[PDB]
Amino acid sequence: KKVNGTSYKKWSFDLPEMSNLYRLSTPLRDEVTDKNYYYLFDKKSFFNGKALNNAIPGGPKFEPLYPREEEEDYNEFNSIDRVIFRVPIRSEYKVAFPHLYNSRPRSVRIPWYNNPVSCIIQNDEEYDTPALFFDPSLNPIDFTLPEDFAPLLAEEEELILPNTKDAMSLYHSPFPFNRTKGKMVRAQDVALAKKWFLQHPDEEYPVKVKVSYQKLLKNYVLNELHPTLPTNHNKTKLLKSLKNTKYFQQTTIDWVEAGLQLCRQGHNMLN
Amino acid sequence: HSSRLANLIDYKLRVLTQDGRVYIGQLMAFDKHMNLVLNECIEERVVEKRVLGLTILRGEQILSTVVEDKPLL
């Protein structure tokens, strides 16, 4: 009932078990969930920065997508004696509204505009506060029927259960923790520290740490920009075609034994 | 009860009226006041004939019902 079988392909969990994993995984999954955090700091804004050769603070830098800007028409249109300087167009504006604040934008994608301002209230300190409770941050603001007529759920007396505080907590958490079901991944497919450099660093970090944050963003943007798709024909798979023959056999051994063999085996091949 | 009227549902019947007319046509609906609606109606005053179409006769005007033909598929 928890996994499908020994082949270990699918899993299916329960709510007190998912809470407990969610509580244990606090120091690696602690992150800012609401989508307005990533305003001007998501993929398409990094794509627009790369394509316009403009630099969001904290974001990566690239080579110019259109490096030849030496061509120039001497025209009266953008003459400064015509122009009213009232607000400096800082570079965050060019990413937020790319067709308005840029003349000649190419290879630009339309950004997501807004998300509703999130009002989620949760506490971390006391677990014994109820699920429904007034937050200190909130603004304070003839005829008879037959008896045994009741509310339709008057038979169950309470609306706060011992697990419904955890359920709500799980409901707002990000993937994979807002689900109780799923398939299994490889251990190298789980990107544990990737959510750290997708956020803004700090101010108090030294410059050595803040450079490393931007270098990790830069590789992230280039992987999203140039996808390489797998081809459907390639199911041949070296280790399956090799176990068809007489010459290979199977056994089961310790990992440290298997690796000490490959050291001995590779030293023979080179000699 | 009301088990007998539903089993005739989707069936052509002959229902005699209090005035004496017997309209014939397939049964579309039935109600708690004896209100029935019929499709393909033909009244027989008597040697005569009449073509109406879809009618919903009342429970006051009805006398009885008797099924003429079995259910059509």
């Binding site: 249109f77 007034f134 909130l138 339709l152 759920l153 169950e156 609306l159 | -």
Partner: protein, 783 residues
Amino acid sequence: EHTIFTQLKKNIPKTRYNRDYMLSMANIPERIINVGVIGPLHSGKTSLMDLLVIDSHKRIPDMSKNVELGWKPLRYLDNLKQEIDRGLSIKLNGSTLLCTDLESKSRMINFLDAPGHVNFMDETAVALAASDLVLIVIDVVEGVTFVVEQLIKQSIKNNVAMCFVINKLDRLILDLKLPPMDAYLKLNHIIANINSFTKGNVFSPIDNNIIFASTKLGFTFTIKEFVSYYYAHSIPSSKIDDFTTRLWGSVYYHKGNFRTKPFENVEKYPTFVEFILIPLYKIFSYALSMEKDKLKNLLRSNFRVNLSQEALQYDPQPFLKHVLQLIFRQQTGLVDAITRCYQPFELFDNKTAHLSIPGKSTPEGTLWAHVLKTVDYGGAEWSLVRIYSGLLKRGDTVRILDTSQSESRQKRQLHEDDETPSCEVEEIGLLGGRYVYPVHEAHKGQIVLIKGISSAYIKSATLYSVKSKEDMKQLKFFKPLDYITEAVFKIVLQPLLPRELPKLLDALNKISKYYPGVIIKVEESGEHVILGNGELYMDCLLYDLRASYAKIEIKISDPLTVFSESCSNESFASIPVSNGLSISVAAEPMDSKMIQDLSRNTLGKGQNCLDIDGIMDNPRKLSKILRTEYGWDSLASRNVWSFYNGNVLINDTLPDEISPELLSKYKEQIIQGFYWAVKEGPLAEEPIYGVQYKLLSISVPSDVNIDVMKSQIIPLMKKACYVGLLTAIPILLEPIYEVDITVHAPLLPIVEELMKKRRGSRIYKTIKVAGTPLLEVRGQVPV
């Protein structure tokens, strides 16, 4: 590359109800209802339209397994690629659906879904002029905001029925975590707030005016829907209409008896909490936390709701959506509120009286329809038309008159071949979101799409066809449409290659067509000027200009504004200017209350009111208002020659007492000069605003021919307004936006720092948005 659209007619999704039966409803004018959904940003309007669309069909090919479980929203009416990518509603769209109320009576309803962002209020105006009824959708966290208040006022001003949806009730439980008592006081605060802006009309849940919804979790309910579902069976039939009135507000139940006050020793809850809210929270709390085998028995014994085996493996958010859609059946209760929420006998007379001139009747033998907007639907150009009379067929030849041409034609009929051109109707369709359903003919009162009209007008049209000539005396023409905001934001364009200018011109016309709130001007120097509502509005315009309509590059400008010209004091010198005509014009400031009413276009105050277009016809009624309300002199009040876009022209001169029939021949020649002057100015060729003009002295030469004297007075009265203004301490005027800010409470000093860094930017109101940790801040910022 532009839209997601079902091109193949075999791939049009099959509908549960019969299409042909719905088309047979179109002959009966009463069975058709037009509803427009309006609201602020992200109130849930498009996802309210999706609950209606999903229930009518059986399988939708674009629907993914991800949106079918409930993780992502279908956004079926967000058809465009820019709406998918901005994540906003930019253009009006809708569907024609068959809707069956609580007593199983089917109604053909055309919905029109309007975008809720503030820079797209011109799209709201197209929906307001097309809809018998409006749904105004509110957010239960955000509340009755200042944008909500303006939408309340515009529907009262458009004589349409308003019915309210309080959306996003999930945020009241899962996000804010309010106990079931406080959410009652919260909902009470909003309904009390709505009635403060709607005068003489009360809005309450028992009246079926106010619908509670949560469109993410996929349900709508009314109390009259909810009692007919689950409470009607237990108590007898005579009580169910009396019982429902006791649900809302300060009346209590303990053991069979209803009284207004709490009992001595009973937990004290109102009827709405006891019978509706606490069972609603027990749905949320037990779908999350309760064991499935225990939960399955409760939903079977209390609701007659059976859970399949597939639903028991669901993740918690799709399981919460599945149970709530299994308890609340369909949108029937929302459909039922529309029917009782609108009586056409009271408003269909006053609504067509507002969209044209008020007149006694239409002969209804003639076809009389209203073109509202040209739309870029699918891969072609269509026209969104509401028909008011007659019958329109595919193949008709119809007269199409632009509504800027209508006002002069309306003045001619009060005093033979029609100048209005003729066009064939090539194809007729019905709105389906991502498709057009072809229908051969259209009837009175239904909103459809027509191909073959678009070339004959720019923004709007009046669509008519006659067989007589006596109806040409009878016929009434539509006004130009009031788009609710005004285009101030200014960007100047130039094509990057000069040879590409013929391709820019073809694109700037379509952008003048598909965007009804845009003013395209051409200056004298060859530069083009675009005017619109804001940053987001330009960005969307400039995208379709760069990527859709012209595939050329454009040099554009920094953000700008339009200025106006006024004066601080009266003219001192009263200089005459001569081209042998001797015109002498003074110029004064108008009152701060006088200009105040001309922007609203209502004249007077309170008890007697005068429309700005009817202002010339009644002289005696006008001067009665001008003397009583504003305290003007009687010599001015009988002699007000004209009212213009902010300014006034008043006659205080001597030879009108002497030779008025000499000068009455010239007032049409003078008033063409006064209009051609004030459209520009003396300072910067900017239009003049808020200046009181007096003509002090006029001298006309003797024995000169009238036809050459027409040519002299127009540029000279142009100059005398210039010389009259330049002697009056001329000033430059500047538009100022109003600001609406939602912010969290401890971040309030930071938002004040932003308002100080801008120039002329003050805040006024700081409103505690009650029961939330949020503030509302109202202020002003210059454009």
